Amino acid sequence: LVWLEAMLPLGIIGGMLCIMGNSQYYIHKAYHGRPKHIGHDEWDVAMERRDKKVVEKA
Amino acid sequence: MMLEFAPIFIYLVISLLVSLILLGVPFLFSRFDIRFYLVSILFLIFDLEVTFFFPWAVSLNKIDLFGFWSMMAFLFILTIGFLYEWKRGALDWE
Amino acid sequence: MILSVLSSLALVSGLMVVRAKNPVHSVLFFILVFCDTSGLLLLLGLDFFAMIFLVVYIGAIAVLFLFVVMMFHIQIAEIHEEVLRYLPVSGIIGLIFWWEMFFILDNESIPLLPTQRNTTSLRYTVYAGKVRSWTNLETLGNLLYTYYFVWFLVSSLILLVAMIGAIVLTMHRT
Amino acid sequence: MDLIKYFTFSMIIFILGIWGILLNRRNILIMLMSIELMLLAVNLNFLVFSVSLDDMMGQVFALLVLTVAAAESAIGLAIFVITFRVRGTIAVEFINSIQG
Amino acid sequence: YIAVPAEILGIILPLLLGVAFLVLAERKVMAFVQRRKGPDVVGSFGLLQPLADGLKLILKEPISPSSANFFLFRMAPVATFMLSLVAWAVVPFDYGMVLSDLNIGLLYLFAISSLGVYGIIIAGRSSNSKYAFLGALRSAAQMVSYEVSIGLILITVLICVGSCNLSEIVMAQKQIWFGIPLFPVLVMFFISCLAETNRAPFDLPEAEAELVAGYNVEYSSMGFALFFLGEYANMILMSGLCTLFFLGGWLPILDLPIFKKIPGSIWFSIKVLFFLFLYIWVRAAFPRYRYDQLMGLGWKVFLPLSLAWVVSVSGLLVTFQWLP
Amino acid sequence: ASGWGITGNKGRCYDFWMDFSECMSHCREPKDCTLLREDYLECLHHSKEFQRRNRIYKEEQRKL
Amino acid sequence: MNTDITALEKAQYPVVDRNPAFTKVVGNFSTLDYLRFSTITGISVTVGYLSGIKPGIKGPSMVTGGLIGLMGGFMYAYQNSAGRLMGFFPNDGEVASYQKR
Amino acid sequence: MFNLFLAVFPEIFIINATFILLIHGVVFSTSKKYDYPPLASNVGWLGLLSVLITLLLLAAGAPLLTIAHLFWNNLFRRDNFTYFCQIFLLLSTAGTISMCFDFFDQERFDAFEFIVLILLSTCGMLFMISAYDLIAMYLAIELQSLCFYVIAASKRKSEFSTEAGLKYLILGAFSSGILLFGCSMIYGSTGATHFDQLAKILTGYEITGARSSGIFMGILFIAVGFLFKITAVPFHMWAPDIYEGSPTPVTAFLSIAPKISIFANILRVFIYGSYGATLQQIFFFCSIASMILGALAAMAQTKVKRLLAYSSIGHVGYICIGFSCGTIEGIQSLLIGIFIYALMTMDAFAIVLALRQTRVKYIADLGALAKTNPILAITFSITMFSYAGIPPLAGFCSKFYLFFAALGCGAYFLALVGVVTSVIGCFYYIRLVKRMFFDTPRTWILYEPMDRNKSLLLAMTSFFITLFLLYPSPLFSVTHQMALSLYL
Ligand SMILES: C[C@@H]1CC[C@@]2(OC1)O[C@H]1C[C@H]3[C@@H]4CC=C5C[C@@H](OCCC(CO[C@H]6O[C@H](CO)[C@@H](O[C@H]7O[C@H](CO)[C@@H](O)[C@H](O)[C@H]7O)[C@H](O)[C@H]6O)CO[C@H]6O[C@H](CO)[C@@H](O[C@H]7O[C@H](CO)[C@@H](O)[C@H](O)[C@H]7O)[C@H](O)[C@H]6O)CC[C@]5(C)[C@H]4CC[C@]3(C)[C@H]1[C@@H]2C
Ligand SMILES: C[C@@H]1CC[C@@]2(OC1)O[C@H]1C[C@H]3[C@@H]4CC=C5C[C@@H](OCCC(CO[C@H]6O[C@H](CO)[C@@H](O[C@H]7O[C@H](CO)[C@@H](O)[C@H](O)[C@H]7O)[C@H](O)[C@H]6O)CO[C@H]6O[C@H](CO)[C@@H](O[C@H]7O[C@H](CO)[C@@H](O)[C@H](O)[C@H]7O)[C@H](O)[C@H]6O)CC[C@]5(C)[C@H]4CC[C@]3(C)[C@H]1[C@@H]2C
Ligand SMILES: CCCCCCCCCCCCCCCCCC(=O)O[C@@H](COC(=O)CCCCCCCCCCCCCCC)COP(=O)(O)OCC[N+](C)(C)C
Ligand SMILES: CCCCCCCCCCCCCCCCCC(=O)O[C@@H](COC(=O)CCCCCCCCCCCCCCC)COP(=O)(O)OC[C@H](O)CO
Ligand SMILES: CCCCCCCCCCCCCCCCCCCC(=O)O[C@H](COC(=O)CCCCCCCCCCCCCC)COP(=O)(O)OCCN
Ligand SMILES: COC1=C(OC)C(=O)C(C/C=C(\C)CC/C=C(\C)CC/C=C(/C)CC/C=C(\C)CCC=C(C)C)=C(C)C1=O
């Protein structure tokens, strides 16, 4: 069971990777109000720009 | 859209700053070997091969059989060149 | 403004290509020029070409130049010369080229002077072309291998010539 | 003003290649480098025009020109290598024996 | 955009910590195979060892030998370190967990990989030492040689997916992980990753005892640390790429509610950890090739097999009309 | 003239090109196709459009 | 892939088959086509043999010359047969066989 | 689908045969069992065979080369003009190859890759002739150029050969960049690269006051590249150095085939396109400069190769006079001049290659040749008098047309220049005859007799040169046919 000593640094590396994912995910969500959408294309950008008008001018 | 490239630039700026901080804080307290040219040439050729592979790989669904065989002919020419290099000893470093 | 920054970087880096006393330094500045060019390509929306300029010009061609120039170990005495006496000949040739060739598009492509009015509202949006947008990569790949495949294959022949010539001119088998 | 700015960028690269030919009479490696600079400028000209004209022909030819530039540099550097090997030097006074 | 620097730091800082502890994990696993204890004095279970080593390095006087390439000598480690860092901007850790959702992300990764060679070349040339120069030339040649096979394997995955978007590459493996049908391609990719990161059995710069001086032999203090950190960050990145391309990234092993309970970032992390363990294990298990032998392997074995796999995958998918 | 657009649809100036080409394919004098030709070239470079808008900007700067 | 066989210069003989299939063209080979084929191949093998004697590889040289001659002769015979079926070459035999089957 | 490729049967065959020869050569040149035999002559004979089979395929399938023209339209354009140009190119390549075997075996130039590079350059020139778009034209030109760069440096331990290669690559790459810039300017100004589209856009306007400076400078840069390729003054100085420093078979090949290919390109670009009087003036001034400089520099030469190089520069000046005048007879005369100059150059280089077996270098080395080989001295004298344009030898056609156009376009300074340069040329051509027949040197050089290939080629070209004007009808008719086919 001594070999569990070697699993601690690997566990730390895994937690580090989980942080690099989740911290950037939550900061983006807090700033934009919704999570990042994978595959934002021309259509989605045009939708957001037109939706700014359709919301604010209502 | 090119919007997604802006975070990459800001990331580069921050990574550069981290590099300067780490490197700068301790300042406070005649034998030409042709085989390298030859390996450079081979890398150039296969670099262009990968370059031409990229659009083909994303376009296979639209170009169908004609595009497949045209790329096959391209590869046949380049692979004849590769066979020539292999036979001539360009791939041997001994 | 951003194009002013990138063009200034390219101008200085290119002058360094052509004026650095050490040829290894010239190769490194050349690499800076290709980086700036890639930036311009990103501004044009051509991300495939922007990446390919890094992969091929910097990743393969400049590496070849660097390997060759580094192993040459050129002494400055062999390639040194004073360039002060070229300022006039460069002045006339540069100016004539400057006066003719920086302004060649002006009569055909007259710039739109930016006015003190919001013209952005006159941008007309056609959503029909936005239902299924094509990347630069797939637009190019739709054409290279079918409608213009002969030119593709001739380029392959050019590369084969390069391989054969590289072997025949330099090979000394141990 | 976009198109004039993109064109003058490529134009300064081309003029720099010309100047590099003019200013490097004892340095033929830099002369080769200046020729690549001109080729890069032409490639940029094709890409800018493709966008401005909304036409793909400029892009196909740009890729093929990159292939030509690669082959050109490979063969040119091979010729440089063998010239150096024969003479032991790259100085221009040792490549002037053919004349008249 | 004001919050973008926070996201960037939330990527970069945990990555640097992860590298610091990857060094410790390598030491621990190597020791345990060798029936000894690795660092276990500096901190409990040796967990403070990386901080002590980093502190020692920053408190070490820099040397900067009297060369004529004063600027280049210090900038080479900066270049390699920055290149190791910037590849992570496009790496997705889970659905929507990615800094830059590049449509051309695969080619971008290839470009970064191709750029990696310049730090080593410039370090060798600028150091004013024939041994460093020769070692740097050999290492650079090895990296460019194995980059060809890496690119061709990338093309195989691209043919299967039909998009250069890394997240799309992950989500295309919902039906089956690409590592199952393309298992030999995955083995080839892992070996090519070993060779591309100058890792055992391909670690020429580590072969000082074999009369082969490394490219960083003249470096001290934080330039040497920058080279080391870039190398280990690249090891983590190669493990991540193996996970993304062949083990389905953040996807669970089986599409079942029991497996879907645990977050995708944890799946991704566990697969990355497996590949890092394999890195260490391989270094512990085998001797190293000579330069000529590994060059022969790069050009005579991995290139032909990669090209053959490209042809076979494309031909099969075209024939039965299974293309994306 | 090719018709292949940079975003995967018909090029912006291709219909003008085709009108000009179809005109020239049967008119024995090119002066009969001058209008269509200048329409094609105007689509490529927008020279007259931008010139007219610059006249408007000029008059605005003069009356201010 | 859109295709269009239409030639710039029209056929001057009756068009038996506008775009004949590969196997149809091969099956259309006449005695003269086979004579052309065999002559080209034989000359090529002979050149391979004679030019191979000095290097000492007359056998392999014969094989290489024969491969070149086989490919060239087959291409020439195919050219003639397809041109006859398409009406570009005098095709009395093709017309006679067409007016009967 | 397969039948569409009948339009490219000749090219497919030659490319495949070249690949076969590459594989054959590399497999057996490396053979320990066979003791690494030299394969330059074996591959040369097989490649001569391949060229002749390509010629058969092309000549016998004249209508078939136009099949599926709409499908191939955006790639190339085959017609009667390209038909005859390609046939002539293949014939020239076959002759040049046939002249190489004594060089292969006696020098022991064992590199079979030489033949492969020649064949690939022939493929490139074939595609050059049929090019109908700026992109295709550039690609084919580059393939041809890269093959020449490599073969110019084939004697890779020679100072001369390496110097030739280096000068060629640098100056060739520079000129190619200039031409590509011109192509980019034309595309940007017109949105087109296909020759038909360019013809439609540019016709009817030339310089109508509102001239596209982009179109005008694109044409100029393309013309500069073309003039470099045809070795027209002032873009000529690469040619004498490259011609002298390259291996003599390379020099013979470069002297003929690229001119045919590039003149096909020039005809189909400019003649078929439209900026107009400016470009004909370009070629007019370059023709005059080439005639004058070629005459004077050739008069200065003491070495045979350099003399022939400067002679070729002068003759391309004479030929470009025909392009300048812009008439059906001008094009016909240009073609007649190209054909006759090619045959004469083949004759001259067959003699030069025969004499290279005893290392001929200087004109004075020909002394007493009328004694040591009388029939060879007479044959070489006929070539010189033909070069001088003395009637009734075949060379008289170019002189006759030069003055015909001088009085047809209405140009008397051109006629004066032609008279003076013709007299200068006659002097330096008859100097060789004087050296072989009139001089009595103290030391003689005895030359080894030529091989059968060169003797037969010399015998046929010598009958043509002496007897062409007795039966010149087929050339006249075929060249008139080609000139007409450019527009109809
Ligand atoms: C050594 C040291 C030890 C200590 C330590 O360091 C190291 O150890 C380290 C270890 C770290 C933990 C590691 C992991 C997590 C999980 C994370 O939490 C899940 C992430 C969130 C989002 O991500 C999910 O969601 C994605 C999208 O679906 C999933 O994608 C799917 O779909 C893809 C496409 O099909 C497929 O491709 C994928 O395969 C498929 O899975 C993705 O996988 C999945 O992750 C969870 O979301 C939820 O939260 C939402 C909040 O809004 C709620 O929304 C709801 O409310 C809205 C408003 O009304 C409504 O509008 C909505 O409709 C309605 O749903 C709702 O509760 C629910 O959505 C919370 C953080 C934590 C605990 C970390 C903490 C810090 C540590 C303890 C570190 C610690 C420091
Ligand atoms: C892997 C290795 C590592 C190294 C590496 O790779 C290799 O790493 C790689 C990483 C690369 C960097 C990646 C990323 C960038 C950013 C880019 O920079 C974006 C600039 C573009 C985008 O800018 C805006 O774009 C939108 C506005 O356009 C903004 O949208 C708003 O406006 C919308 C409309 O109302 C609303 O709807 C939206 O809601 C609203 O938000 C958007 O927010 C904003 O981003 C272009 O913009 C400009 O262009 C304009 C046009 O010319 C100029 O207009 C001007 O001229 C006009 C007349 O012409 C006059 O009329 C005008 O009045 C007058 O102003 C003006 O200068 C300026 O706007 C510059 C290049 C660079 C640095 C790359 C360099 C090279 C690398 C380092 C590579 C490197 C090599
Ligand atoms: C009128 C034209 C305009 C002016 C130009 C004139 C150009 C010539 C200059 C004239 C001045 C005098 C020229 C003297 C040349 C005459 C001598 C001569 O050439 O004799 C040759 C003869 O050269 C020839 O071989 C000429 C052959 C040409 C064939 C042309 C005839 C075609 C049909 C004839 C059919 C065959 C013969 C029929 C009868 C048997 C002998 O060559 P040798 O080198 O001495 O020895 C040759 C070796 N051996 C004798 C052993 C074989
Ligand atoms: C390392 C791998 C080497 C592979 C070498 C072997 C293959 C080399 C390529 C040989 C040419 C094709 C041989 C394969 C025969 C099968 C062809 C076939 O199946 O016919 C298809 C058609 O295939 C072709 O016609 C493509 C031919 C490829 C071009 C090869 C070049 C031949 C000569 C070109 C002349 C140009 C000059 C050459 C320049 C150097 C039918 O398609 P379709 O008409 O139904 O629809 C078209 C398509 O599906 C939609 O886009
Ligand atoms: C038009 C004006 C009037 C012209 C009159 C034309 C009349 C027709 C010609 C009649 C020919 C009379 C001689 C016929 C018998 C000779 C048969 C040659 C026998 C032979 O096999 O020669 C072989 C060599 O190939 C060779 O020597 C043959 C190749 C020589 C080059 C021939 C042309 C090939 C390429 C085409 C070029 C076209 C150029 C056009 C621009 C081997 O000979 P060997 O046994 O003695 O040993 C040589 C040592 N290796
Ligand atoms: C004997 O005295 C001397 C000269 O005097 C002949 C000289 O020159 C020079 C040195 C200066 C030179 C050579 C500059 C001349 C260079 C030029 C004009 C560059 C162009 C190159 C060539 C070969 C000229 C070809 C161009 C021509 C004929 C005209 C251009 C084209 C058209 C009209 C279409 C020296 C030392 C000299 O001591």
Side-chain angles (χ1 to χ4, degrees), chain A residues 15 18-19 22 25-26 29, chain E residues 94-95 97 171 250-251 263-265:
Chain A
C18 289
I19 290 170
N22 286 273
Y25 178 89
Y26 278 91
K29 197 205 186 204
Chain E
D94 200 345
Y95 177 80
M97 301 211 186
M171 303 165 86
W250 64 80
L251 292 172
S265 49

Side-chain angles (χ1 to χ4, degrees), chain B residues 63-66 69-70 72 76, chain C residues 153 157, chain G residues 1, chain H residues 1 12 127:
Chain B
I63 63 193
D64 201 5
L65 278 179
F66 197 105
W69 288 113
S70 70
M72 282 325 106
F76 176 82
Chain C
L153 294 184
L157 284 185
Chain G
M1 276 255 101
Chain H
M1 167 64 83
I12 287 175
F127 280 113

